[PDB]
Amino acid sequence: EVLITGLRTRAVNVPLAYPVHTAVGTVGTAPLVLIDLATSAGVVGHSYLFAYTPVALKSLKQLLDDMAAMIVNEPLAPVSLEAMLAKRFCLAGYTGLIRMAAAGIDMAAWDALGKVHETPLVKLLGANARPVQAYDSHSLDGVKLATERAVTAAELGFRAVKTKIGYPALDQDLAVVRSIRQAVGDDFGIMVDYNQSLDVPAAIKRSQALQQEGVTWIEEPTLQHDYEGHQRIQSKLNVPVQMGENWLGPEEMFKALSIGACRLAMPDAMKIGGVTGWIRASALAQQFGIPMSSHLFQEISAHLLAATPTAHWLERLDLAGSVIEPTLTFEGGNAVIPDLPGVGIIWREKEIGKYLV
Amino acid sequence: EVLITGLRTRAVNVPLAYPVHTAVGTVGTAPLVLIDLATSAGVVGHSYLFAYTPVALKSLKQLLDDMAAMIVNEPLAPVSLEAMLAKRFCLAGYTGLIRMAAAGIDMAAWDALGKVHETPLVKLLGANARPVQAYDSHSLDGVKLATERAVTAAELGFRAVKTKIGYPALDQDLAVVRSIRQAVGDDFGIMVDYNQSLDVPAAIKRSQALQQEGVTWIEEPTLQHDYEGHQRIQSKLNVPVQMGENWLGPEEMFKALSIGACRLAMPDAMKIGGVTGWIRASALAQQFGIPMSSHLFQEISAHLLAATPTAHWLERLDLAGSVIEPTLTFEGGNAVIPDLPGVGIIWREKEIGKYLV
Amino acid sequence: EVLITGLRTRAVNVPLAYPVHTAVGTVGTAPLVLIDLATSAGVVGHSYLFAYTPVALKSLKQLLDDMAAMIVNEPLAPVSLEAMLAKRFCLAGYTGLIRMAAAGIDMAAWDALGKVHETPLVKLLGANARPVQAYDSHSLDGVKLATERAVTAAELGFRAVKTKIGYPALDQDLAVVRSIRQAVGDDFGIMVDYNQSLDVPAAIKRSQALQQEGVTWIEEPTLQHDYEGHQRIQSKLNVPVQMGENWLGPEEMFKALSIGACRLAMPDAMKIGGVTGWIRASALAQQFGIPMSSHLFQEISAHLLAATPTAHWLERLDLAGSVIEPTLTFEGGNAVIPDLPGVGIIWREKEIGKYLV
Amino acid sequence: EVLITGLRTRAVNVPLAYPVHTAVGTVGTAPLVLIDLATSAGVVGHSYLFAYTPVALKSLKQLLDDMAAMIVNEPLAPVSLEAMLAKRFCLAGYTGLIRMAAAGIDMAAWDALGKVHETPLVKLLGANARPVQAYDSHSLDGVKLATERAVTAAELGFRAVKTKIGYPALDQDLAVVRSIRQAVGDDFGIMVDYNQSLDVPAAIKRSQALQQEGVTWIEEPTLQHDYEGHQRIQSKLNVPVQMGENWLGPEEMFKALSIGACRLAMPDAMKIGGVTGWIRASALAQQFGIPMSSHLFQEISAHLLAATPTAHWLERLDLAGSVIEPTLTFEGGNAVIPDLPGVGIIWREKEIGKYLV
Amino acid sequence: EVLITGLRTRAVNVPLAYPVHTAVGTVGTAPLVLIDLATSAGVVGHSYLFAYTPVALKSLKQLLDDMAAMIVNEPLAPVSLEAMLAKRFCLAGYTGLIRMAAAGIDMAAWDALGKVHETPLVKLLGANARPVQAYDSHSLDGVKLATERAVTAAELGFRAVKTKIGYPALDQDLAVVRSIRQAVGDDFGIMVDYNQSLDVPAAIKRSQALQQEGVTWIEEPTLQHDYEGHQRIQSKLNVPVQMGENWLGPEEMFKALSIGACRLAMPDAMKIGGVTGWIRASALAQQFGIPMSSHLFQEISAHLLAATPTAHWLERLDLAGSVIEPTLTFEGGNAVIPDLPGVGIIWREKEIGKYLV
Ligand SMILES: O=NN(O)c1ccccc1
Ligand SMILES: O=NN(O)c1ccccc1
Ligand SMILES: O=NN(O)c1ccccc1
Ligand SMILES: O=NN(O)c1ccccc1
Ligand SMILES: O=NN(O)c1ccccc1
Ligand SMILES: [Mg+2]
Ligand SMILES: [Mg+2]
Ligand SMILES: [Mg+2]
Ligand SMILES: [Mg+2]
Ligand SMILES: [Mg+2]
Structure with a gap:
């Protein structure tokens, strides 16, 4: 069984050649969480999350880091990992920032699984x-x-x-x-x-x-x-x-x-x-x-x-x-x-x- | 007239006499974010948020702390403040942790408003x-x-x-x-x-x-x-x-x-x-x-x-x-x-x- | 507890610079009931009712005056006062003239409550x-x-x-x-x-x-x-x-x-x-x-x-x-x-x- | 041919052998408006209204008394009279006390019509x-x-x-x-x-x-x-x-x-x-x-x-x-x-x- | 009580100045059943039925004549007479020719009732x-x-x-x-x-x-x-x-x-x-x-x-x-x-x- 061995995130606020103006406000730079999901097969899964506003950026990174402990030593089986997360966040509300973080994990996990099978x-x-x-x-x-x-x-x-x-x-x-x-x-x-x-x-x-x-x-x-x-x-x-x-x-x-x-x-x-x-x-x-x-x-x-x-x-x-x-x-x-x-x-x-x- | 002049949050993890066991997991402590909303009238609004699990606790605090920039110097008018928050989080998703943060502010703002009017x-x-x-x-x-x-x-x-x-x-x-x-x-x-x-x-x-x-x-x-x-x-x-x-x-x-x-x-x-x-x-x-x-x-x-x-x-x-x-x-x-x-x-x-x- | 201490109404029929012609008839003057709601904090709430036709004007004023006794000595708490009135008119039909009169009381009560809190x-x-x-x-x-x-x-x-x-x-x-x-x-x-x-x-x-x-x-x-x-x-x-x-x-x-x-x-x-x-x-x-x-x-x-x-x-x-x-x-x-x-x-x-x- | 020539109302409050207790209040007397509709054929139509509570009694009488101007000299034709009343109260709300007043007229008009035809x-x-x-x-x-x-x-x-x-x-x-x-x-x-x-x-x-x-x-x-x-x-x-x-x-x-x-x-x-x-x-x-x-x-x-x-x-x-x-x-x-x-x-x-x- | 004392019908086929052409066929003449409803007050009610085609004309007249016995000696009270007919034709099917015949009776009965009251x-x-x-x-x-x-x-x-x-x-x-x-x-x-x-x-x-x-x-x-x-x-x-x-x-x-x-x-x-x-x-x-x-x-x-x-x-x-x-x-x-x-x-x-x- 390939296992997840670690999670590392990095928050960036990256420049846009063209700021995204909308009728409800502007997104002038990209607040992103970059995700590395380490595995026991030696590959590293990558994904990222878009936090929309810098106001939500640190909160999103913090949440992922705090989620590290519940995924480390789980099998790299994104579908089973998603069900485990849906259950762990049952009470708190499996939506919003928490669901976005769970998605970030999911995307890095499928990247990792593709890498495992080259x-x-x-x-x-x-x-x-x-x-x-x-x-x-x-x-x-x-x-x-x-x-x-x-x-x-x-x-x-x-x-x-x-x-x-x-x-x-x-x-x-x-x-x-x-x-x-x-x-x-x-x-x-x-x-x-x-x-x-x-x-x-x-x-x-x-x-x-x-x-x-x-x-x-x-x-x-x-x-x-x-x-x-x-x-x-x-x-x-x-x-x-x-x-x-x-x-x-x-x-x-x-x-x-x-x-x-x-x-x-x-x-x-x-x-x-x-x-x-x-x-x-x-x-x-x-x-x-x-x-x-x-x-x-x-x-x-x-x-x-x-x-x-x-x-x-x-x-x-x-x-x-x-x-x-x-x-x-x-x-x-x-x-x-x-x-x-x-x-x-x-x-x-x-x-x-x-x-x- | 009355303006918000500060926001302060405190994360606490309070052991419960009787842990809240549920069919989908146990909440053994109450992870709460305690909120103080300072006003130009000098009274301070109090409320708190329940984060359900320690996993979401620091993220939720950080979230509020970063939301402070949106509310400090705004009039203490809970209804207009809520409309402003819905608009600010229009793109990112005005739900989940974000909506909970906004609700803590609202509850402390109404506490403050009751205090203004004694x-x-x-x-x-x-x-x-x-x-x-x-x-x-x-x-x-x-x-x-x-x-x-x-x-x-x-x-x-x-x-x-x-x-x-x-x-x-x-x-x-x-x-x-x-x-x-x-x-x-x-x-x-x-x-x-x-x-x-x-x-x-x-x-x-x-x-x-x-x-x-x-x-x-x-x-x-x-x-x-x-x-x-x-x-x-x-x-x-x-x-x-x-x-x-x-x-x-x-x-x-x-x-x-x-x-x-x-x-x-x-x-x-x-x-x-x-x-x-x-x-x-x-x-x-x-x-x-x-x-x-x-x-x-x-x-x-x-x-x-x-x-x-x-x-x-x-x-x-x-x-x-x-x-x-x-x-x-x-x-x-x-x-x-x-x-x-x-x-x-x-x-x-x-x-x-x-x-x- | 601030209390309601009295109700006074006055019926007027007031001139319109421009009579309101509609395809179903004309309202040439304004038949109004002017409402004063006295309180134990010394302020007086004001509102008025529009009776549409002079035919309904005296009836509306009479109804309010007869309602005085059920609101006098009640707390000036418009929401609780509305529920009390919905219950008192349960049988008779909480609609039409009776509902309009209850609304007149409500609007004077919220005026009074604003005055209590200046x-x-x-x-x-x-x-x-x-x-x-x-x-x-x-x-x-x-x-x-x-x-x-x-x-x-x-x-x-x-x-x-x-x-x-x-x-x-x-x-x-x-x-x-x-x-x-x-x-x-x-x-x-x-x-x-x-x-x-x-x-x-x-x-x-x-x-x-x-x-x-x-x-x-x-x-x-x-x-x-x-x-x-x-x-x-x-x-x-x-x-x-x-x-x-x-x-x-x-x-x-x-x-x-x-x-x-x-x-x-x-x-x-x-x-x-x-x-x-x-x-x-x-x-x-x-x-x-x-x-x-x-x-x-x-x-x-x-x-x-x-x-x-x-x-x-x-x-x-x-x-x-x-x-x-x-x-x-x-x-x-x-x-x-x-x-x-x-x-x-x-x-x-x-x-x-x-x-x- | 047959015309309405008068309306007379009488408010009475009749004590009941057995007060009508209900889960939402007691009706201890019957507050009724007694109606007489005089006609050019000399017979007089009778009906009455139940006002439910004394609070609505004088208002309801006054309402009918002011409605008299709309019906006196109209033909005794209950159906056309009802259409006319719906139109006259189009704007004000043809419901509640107004609709009840109109119904008393209608019931006395049909009584009168039965009398015309013996x-x-x-x-x-x-x-x-x-x-x-x-x-x-x-x-x-x-x-x-x-x-x-x-x-x-x-x-x-x-x-x-x-x-x-x-x-x-x-x-x-x-x-x-x-x-x-x-x-x-x-x-x-x-x-x-x-x-x-x-x-x-x-x-x-x-x-x-x-x-x-x-x-x-x-x-x-x-x-x-x-x-x-x-x-x-x-x-x-x-x-x-x-x-x-x-x-x-x-x-x-x-x-x-x-x-x-x-x-x-x-x-x-x-x-x-x-x-x-x-x-x-x-x-x-x-x-x-x-x-x-x-x-x-x-x-x-x-x-x-x-x-x-x-x-x-x-x-x-x-x-x-x-x-x-x-x-x-x-x-x-x-x-x-x-x-x-x-x-x-x-x-x-x-x-x-x-x-x- | 005014009573129905007899029913007489007459079938005619009457000329039209302008035959009624439709996209599904022509009605060139009017096949009608003329209905006389005799009463004990001495007046005679009149109505007629339109049978559309001469093919249905004799059948419609025959049905009415056979219905004479169930209405003779009934009160001239068209509403009660309609309910009696709806019940008598319950089993056979109160629709079509039978319903048309019942309608012919109804219209003659209301004519008669108008005549009774002049x-x-x-x-x-x-x-x-x-x-x-x-x-x-x-x-x-x-x-x-x-x-x-x-x-x-x-x-x-x-x-x-x-x-x-x-x-x-x-x-x-x-x-x-x-x-x-x-x-x-x-x-x-x-x-x-x-x-x-x-x-x-x-x-x-x-x-x-x-x-x-x-x-x-x-x-x-x-x-x-x-x-x-x-x-x-x-x-x-x-x-x-x-x-x-x-x-x-x-x-x-x-x-x-x-x-x-x-x-x-x-x-x-x-x-x-x-x-x-x-x-x-x-x-x-x-x-x-x-x-x-x-x-x-x-x-x-x-x-x-x-x-x-x-x-x-x-x-x-x-x-x-x-x-x-x-x-x-x-x-x-x-x-x-x-x-x-x-x-x-x-x-x-x-x-x-x-x-x-
Ligand atoms: O269509 N995409 N929308 O609406 C968008 C994308 C990025 C930032 C803000 C809005
Ligand atoms: O009803 N309260 N529920 O369901 C609850 C309470 C505390 C923690 C989790 C769920
Ligand atoms: O829109 N308002 N309407 O229809 C109105 C207002 C006053 C008097 C009559 C009708
Ligand atoms: O059924 N009659 N009800 O409900 C009633 C009768 C008299 C007074 C109030 C309600
Ligand atoms: O509109 N009336 N229709 O259709 C009609 C009238 C008489 C004869 C045939 C059809
Ligand atoms: Mg529950
Ligand atoms: Mg879009
Ligand atoms: Mg009932
Ligand atoms: Mg309008
Ligand atoms: Mg047609």
Whole structure:
């Protein structure tokens, strides 16, 4: 039996070429927890967590470190390890930061398991590597920069981009989208993301005007937990409502899809519960007829999407590029999984120093 | 006018006379974060958080300490402060540890506001103080200890006790309930709590047997988030299914009640979102026709129940008694709100020093 | 314990600069009951009731006076006082005139409680004063006067107006709206109100033509109690259906929202049950995802809306201006809560004389 | 042709032989408004309203007196008069005291119309007079008085009685029902009435125990407006749940029956909207398969039941007996409509003088 | 007690100025059963039945004659007489021809009862006579005659007409409607009737094209009993679906409205169960929010509609003009009820001879 022998985490706050502006606030740098999971077979599993705000960063690192003792000497069997953690956090609430930390462990464990068998994760999941179409993910950038980032993305061979909207006025949402559209042409996806900023009637009004414009999908139009409200917005639309980045575990995804919140889903490898939760999520999207994309975590999402029966898009937003070797590449807009064991995440150890919190 | 001028937290791990054994693990000490919210009016708001396990304790403290930057210099206006926190944690997930941190702030802010106005909290909410019936809350204690603790509670004048069940065999659940019944008589409540330990069919089978015995309610028979499963259990019962201690915010309560998960509710003053979330929860319980009890936090729950239109039971489990002056008392099994501004929490400073971690 | 020591009411019939014409009849003057609630702390709570027609005015005053004996010597604890009244009127029917009278007591009691603590009501509710956007509320005025009132409102810095429609012909509804629109421009809200005058098919026909025109919302298209019928109208519309002024208590609001009658709500501080009912109402709108405005009662609604999580608009219709000091002001179209304790309602005692019935 | 030419009201407070005790308060006298509707045909229509408590008595009289201006000089056409009243009270809320006032007018107008045609009311409605089975309606009387009143009713030839329950302990509800049962035998109805006193779970628990005893129905187990709660109670019962005395208009009946609140109905001739509302209620009860009884107003209810397709029981509780000639009689427990034009109400003028307030 | 003393029927087949062409066949003459109901007060009640096809005419007359013995010596109390007939035909099936015959009896009985009290039926129902708007009902007439009948109807002051459609091709439906429209102008109702001729998809296609044209309603688009199918068609339309002429009894109407088959209703005085069934029907349309028109039977429908809370249109199609005195008149397109007792139906006895079958 291969055993887990140790856990080490490191908190960084890493710079973004382009700060992520949203209609509810800006993420100017990336607060990350980098996770190393040591094993008795001598390999080291790697993953990372995104804490969104520096306010949650130290708390997340502390929680993982305190969780070290419950995983050390457990078998490196991510599925059994997830059940053990779901039980240990039964009382406290297996959600939120605690679930995110459990996901970080899970992703490092599956990386480790791929390394034990010297096989890329995608193959360990029983699937073939294949290129996965990717959209370049931008932010609430203003007409000028939004249009430039779009052109550049199109120059690099991306077939779609996402821009984050929710400007003070609807006309401003539309001017950004029209300006991207003039510059990329009609054969190009423009996904838009409201980041939860509208109430249901505002969302219906804005969304029907954006749909007239031709957008590829409308993402998180209202409060993320409000699945009934998403359903109400979706009911007034032909264009699909998109959500899922905020589902904490496949049980949240199940509740949203059960009441018809959306016609597309994009779980987040961390929030959905890592590789173990992702695989469950994929089973749900398939039965519910829901094309499934990724949210962040582009390195592991390239593997995961290749094992996903309704795989739709990979989101390109390179949060961890400063501290992770660029072994994932893009050819003609598609993510290409590297020929490395597990996930293909290699730390740029020389760089992690600049960013330690 | 009145501003928040400081936040101070203290992590303590308090050994309990009677460890809280449950079917899914034992809580042998109470890991609490003690909160002091200093104000420009000079009075200081007090509250505390329960972290369930030491594993989450330092993470939760660190979390609050980092949240201080968001609240210091803000007006002492619990409702506007809560709206601000929901917005600040919009992206990261306003749930779990983060929502619990926010609730501790809220509870200490309302304590401070009651202090500003030199009025007990119940009166600031527009209600009168009045004795609230309380059950003495025990645990997965074995036949012998459970009967003994039940006898003791009956002598103290409690008219109900709660025991935690989910022993390996149904015959054992039933033996504990029988032995308590023989000890306390037919005119006496025996609540039971499975702490999420059964799947739906075992819950239906055990619950129907318990209902033949005569129990007052059946609490969390299955996984706390599985509202549809609770409904399925409730559908096969005359006895009421009880839940809610695990609802993170009133929006989770709204989901559970919308599909008929339970016929009783017991929000946890911390998980529900503090005073602000509790008052919202009570509006919901009133409209859905749900008698609403409390879970832990007996000091603030006595106030809050008095303001609760469908107020049912106060749970008495004295987690903070080692560190808080016993200003809340019990006459004839009823909680008696002390005549003290805000919540009536006064730290036992000499005691706190022994439990700091 | 602060106690209620007396109740005094005065019925007035006060002149309106602009009579309120609706498609179901005209309210040419304001029949009001002015309420003074005396306390043992020496302060006096103030509120008023709107009786709609002089036909109900004396009956409403008489009922309050007869209710004096059941509230005198009760604690000034509006929430406990509301429960006592709900119980005392259990048998007779806690709705209609009786519920309106109970609301009048409630609003005077919360005014009194704010005065006891020398704090504006909004702060007593735990929220911060903030300016609240307001629309100027006009009536079934005819193309000429409708357009003038609109211009004037826009001149005073209002960002929207409401006009009451339901003229004998659809073309007349549209000519009024088009004429307001030409004169205010496209960046301006035009709310329309049918005052219950249409049956469901007529409402669907008229409403779809108004929606083509661009209106901000369509208010009470059909019989107020007919929530199923509202839902049927709402189902055929993208523009939101608005209602709520006629909900007697939050239990009526709950029934309407449960079956999807509307996408916006506007409780009436009096009919919803005063401050106590309003706060419950706000909890419902929030969980149901419903932007919540006020109906009349502009003085107390400015406070209430500042404590309302989905606060949407304040309705400006100054029914009581003749007998109430203008301490509420409007800056750039927003209501500004005055810096006075409780509600900030001060009687113009010199003027009440002219209007006594 | 025939016009209304006057309205006269008289408020009386009539002491009752047996005060109507209920679990939520005692009605020790009957506060009634006696109505005389003078016509151009010279006959005068009679009806009365029950105000429940003296607190509402003067307000209700004043209300009618002010409503006189709307009806005097209108044709005596109860149906068109009702439509006019609904429109006049469109804005103010056509419910509660206002709807009760309107119903008194309606009942006196139909009495007058029967007088114009010199025909008993039942015949004007197109039905034959026929004996209607009646239960003798008692109250929250204690074991001893309840048994005694049950024996008396059985000797008078009643085949059923109703008792009001909701004593502090279930054991007490059950003792009263047992003692009545022993007195009257197994071939005899015992209806029971909780007068809104239980929450849903206590209602389910008490109702299941009562159903083991053998009772004829369970009336208003919970808050009268909580139709969803009644359904939840009914869902756990074989015995039928009975309600309706509190429905204000047939539209409230329609809501309750639409969601399955009850398996029996008992509209109140006043609250339902008089004869006009009652005939609408009977159309609904017939379509929803609901046996329909009456509540109070035995004089007019005998006529109305005879015209009611699913007619069940007449409630006999003689509130107006002190002031109305006993022209309605009881043979073998059946109400016998007197052969008198309209309702057959004749004032006892010498008696009325003693009770005027 | 007034008693029924005899029943006499006469079958006629009467000529139509304009044969009624429908998409499922032609009714070129009117097969009618004329009913005389003799009473012991010396008056004679009159009604008639429409048998649709001569194939059913003798069978209908025979059935009534055979029913004579069960009504002779019964009281003239139409409501009690209807219940007796519902019971007598319990086993055989109280629907179809038997229900139509029972309705014929009912309508003659209410005519008789109006005559006993020397009062027009409308007043006996407690309502005021008022003019009722009427549309002139034409048939599947071809572009040329359809347009002429429209002009003539408009010349006589009708504000709307109905034409029967379902031509072999959609373009033909549209050419007829466009041609009527050019000739009447935009301020004029054009109702269209498919007479059950389309399947659900054809109905959705045709109906959406007619709705583009502006029609007032689309009547019986598919198989009359197929309420689910009507609902499916209605779901794809803004214009209202109309039906009801074929509902046999208010219990059929109740089933159709319960599942949302239509947004307008038009019961047929005969099929709905005569005056007794109509009054029940009106109670349903009111609660369900459904504007209610008549189908045929214009003489009694003028009275009935005046007592109908959601009265919408009277259908003018004078089937019985050849054998009934023209006491009903039309002023400015409205039906005017004549000042005669009961229904105002007087036989042209000199003419009945020409048409006896
Ligand atoms: O789509 N992704 N969203 O919304 C995001 C990503 C990173 C930071 C904030 C929001
Ligand atoms: O009801 N209280 N429960 O379930 C509890 C209490 C303490 C620790 C864990 C669970
Ligand atoms: O929107 N408010 N309505 O409808 C109103 C206000 C005052 C008087 C009458 C109607
Ligand atoms: O059934 N009758 N009830 O409930 C009643 C009667 C009189 C007074 C109050 C309630
Ligand atoms: O609308 N009335 N219809 O459909 C009708 C009337 C008479 C004969 C045939 C059909
Ligand atoms: Mg997003
Ligand atoms: Mg528990
Ligand atoms: Mg309005
Ligand atoms: Mg009752
Ligand atoms: Mg037809």
